[PDB]
Amino acid sequence: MSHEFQLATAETWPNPWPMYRALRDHDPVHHVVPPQRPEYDYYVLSRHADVWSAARDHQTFSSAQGLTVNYGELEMIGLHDTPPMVMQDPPVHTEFRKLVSRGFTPRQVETVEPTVRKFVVERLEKLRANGGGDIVTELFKPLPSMVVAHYLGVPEEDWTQFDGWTQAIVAANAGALDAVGSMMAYFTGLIERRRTEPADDAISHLVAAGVGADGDTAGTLSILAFTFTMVTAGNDTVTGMLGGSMPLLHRRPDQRRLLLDDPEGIPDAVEELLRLTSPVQGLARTTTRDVTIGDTTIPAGRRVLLLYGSANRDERQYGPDAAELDVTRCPRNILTFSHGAHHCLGAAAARMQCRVALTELLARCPDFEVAESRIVWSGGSYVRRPLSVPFRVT
Ligand code: HEM
Numbered sequence: 001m002s003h004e005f006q007l008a009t010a011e012t013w014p015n016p017w018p019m020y021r022a023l024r025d026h027d028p029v030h031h032v033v034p035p036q037r038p039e040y041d042y043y044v045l046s047r048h049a050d051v052w053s054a055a056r057d058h059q060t061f062s063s064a065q066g067l068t069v070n071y072g073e074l075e076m077i078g079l080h081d082t083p084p085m086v087m088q089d090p091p092v093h094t095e096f097r098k099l100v101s102r103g104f105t106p107r108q109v110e111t112v113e114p115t116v117r118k119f120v121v122e123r124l125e126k127l128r129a130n131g132g133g134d135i136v137t138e139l140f141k142p143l144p145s146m147v148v149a150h151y152l153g154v155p156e157e158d159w160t161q162f163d164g165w166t167q168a169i170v171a172a173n174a175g176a177l178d179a180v181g182s183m184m185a186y187f188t189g190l191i192e193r194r195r196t197e198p199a200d201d202a203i204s205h206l207v208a209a210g211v212g213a214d215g216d217t218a219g220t221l222s223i224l225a226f227t228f229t230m231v232t233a234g235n236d237t238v239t240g241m242l243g244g245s246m247p248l249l250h251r252r253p254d255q256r257r258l259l260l261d262d263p264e265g266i267p268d269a270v271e272e273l274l275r276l277t278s279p280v281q282g283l284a285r286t287t288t289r290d291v292t293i294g295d296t297t298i299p300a301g302r303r304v305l306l307l308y309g310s311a312n313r314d315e316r317q318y319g320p321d322a323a324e325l326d327v328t329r330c331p332r333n334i335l336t337f338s339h340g341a342h343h344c345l346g347a348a349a350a351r352m353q354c355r356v357a358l359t360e361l362l363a364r365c366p367d368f369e370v371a372e373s374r375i376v377w378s379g380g381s382y383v384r385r386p387l388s389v390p391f392r393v394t
Contacts, residue, residue: 005030005044007069008281013377013384016281017323020046020310029296032069042069042284042303043296048318050293051311052333054285054304056340061285061304063342064089068382069284069303082221084229090341099209100226101345103151103202109348111200112150116356119143124364132368132392136243140389141167143357144238147349148230153194153201158186169228170235174380180228187227191220202226234346236378240279240385241350242357247372247389248276248325249361255327260362269327270354274336275318276325281309281384283338308335309384367394 003022006012023030023046030044045051054061066073066087074080079087085096123139145166149159161182168179191207198204203223206212212220249256259265284303291298298304312335315322337344344350361368369392376388 005032007381008384009381010377010379014372014375016309016384017313020307020313023307024310024314024316029293029298031296040069040071042305043298044282044305044307045293046307046310046314048311048314048316048333048335051306051308051335052339054306055335055338055342058089058341060288060291061306062089062288063087063093063285065286065303067283067285069305071303079225082218082225084225086229086233086342093341096222096226097341097345099206099211100202102205102209103153103200104345104348106348107200108151109352112147112349113352113356115150115156116143116147116353117360119146120356120360121364124360127391128365128393131394132390134388135246135391136239136386136388139357140239140242140386141235143242143353144235147238147353148234151202151234151346151349152187152227152230153190153199153203162186166231166235169231173232174236174378174383183227183231184224187224188220191223202230233344234349236383236385237279238350238353240383241274241277241354243375243386243389244277244279244384245273245354245358246370246386246391247375248273249358250368250370251372252325255325256362256366258327259358260366263359263362265327266355266358267351268330269358270351271331271334272325272327272329273354273358274351275312275329275331275334277384278309278312278334278336279383279385280336280338282307282382306335306338308338311335365393368392369394 003018005019005023008016023044028047028050030046031041032044033041045054064083064087070076074083085093127133127135127138142163145163146159149162154162165179165183168176191203191212194204194207198208206223211223259269282305284305287298287300287302287304289300313322318331337347371390374390375386378385378387
């Protein structure tokens with residue numbers, strides 16, 4: 001047990017909630033001054049109201065210096081020259097987002113759903129036949145990779161090779177030189193193909209809109225950067241949502257009962273699971289001006305950690321039962337996908353995967369066991385996701 005603020009590790013991901021509660025109740029605008037590195041001080045926002053408003057306010061809370069509390073981030077990763085879309089502010093962010101958004105419509109979520117369902121069924125049946133097993137390795141890891149592949153217009157025949165690169169990158173993001181090289185090489189070819197054979201995906205749309213046309217190397221690089229953004233955005237997060245939901249469901253048979261009796265309640269249940277798992281538990285911003293929130297003034301030029309995971313658990317927004325699973329809650333203004341300019345492009349895709357996985361878990365493996373104490377969590381301070389979830393089926 002610890003109620004003192006610290007960036008999470010594999011060992012402290014099981015139960016960050018009391019720490020968050022202490023912040024919300026006693027220091028909602030919390031100044032962190034690392035004793036070993038006081039020059040790397042930063043601030044932490046834990047309440048729903050403050051996080052909601054800060055996420056929206058890109059003018060005051062910029063994404064352009066990076067999304068971690070590490071002040072050397074952009075040079076450390078090698079993206080200072082031209083940061084990716086998630087590290088762009090408007091207006092730079094706006095045009096590119098408009099173009100790629102053409103590949104994030106109901107059509108793209110709908111076309112991949114039968115493929116998602118088929119894979120979920122295949123893997124859950126294998127688990128059922130074997131009385132359980134490694135649900136993360138066999139389902140919750142590979143599934144989101146296929147969906148990201150779909151959104152990038154990777155042909156189905158290349159999904160296995162694409163999974164290989166994805167896993168190396170995801171593990172490293174939590175070097176991957178072979179993977180980064182293979183992927184950037186593969187997409188160079190695919191982008192070229194989309195010049196003459198455009199489909200309905202985000203890459204096809206970027207190419208059709210003339211990004212990279214007429215020797216615009218920088219444009220082409222932006223498409224390549226977007227592929228890396230997608231791999232890092234759409235994988236560990238979904239695995240976190242899926243794996244993180246398992247103990248929550250297991251320990252509430254009454255809540256499973258509600259959905260067994262009314263499967264049409266599953267979409268609402270997905271929102272509640274997204275609220276409580278909040279796979280992106282926090283991301284940072286940089287203040288562009290001094291800003292006062294209550295009795296605290298955050299100086300210009302400092303990182304501010306937006307604790308989405310805490311905002312999602314704030315009793316001021318969701319009541320004294322905010323810590324509990326209620327699949328009929330219908331929570332509004334969840335922070336799981338942030339809010340404002342950078343609102344997750346993959347929200348509908350993530351929701352669809354959760355819906356299909358939950359539907360089939362209840363239909364195919366209703367009697368299951370999860371030992372929460374034996375879950376292994378990934379390292380990394382921003383995304384909360386299991387590497388392994390003990391899973392037994394009777
Ligand atoms: C449950 C799973 C997911 C969670 C919790 C999640 C969370 C988020 C969050 C919090 C942001 C905003 C980042 C910020 O505040 O700076 C974001 C952005 C983004 N996400 Fe997701 N995401 C998920 C799944 C996905 C999927 C499946 C995809 C792709 C199909 C995706 C693609 C993106 C992209 C491209 C952005 C950048 C948007 C922009 O900066 O304008 N995400 N996501």
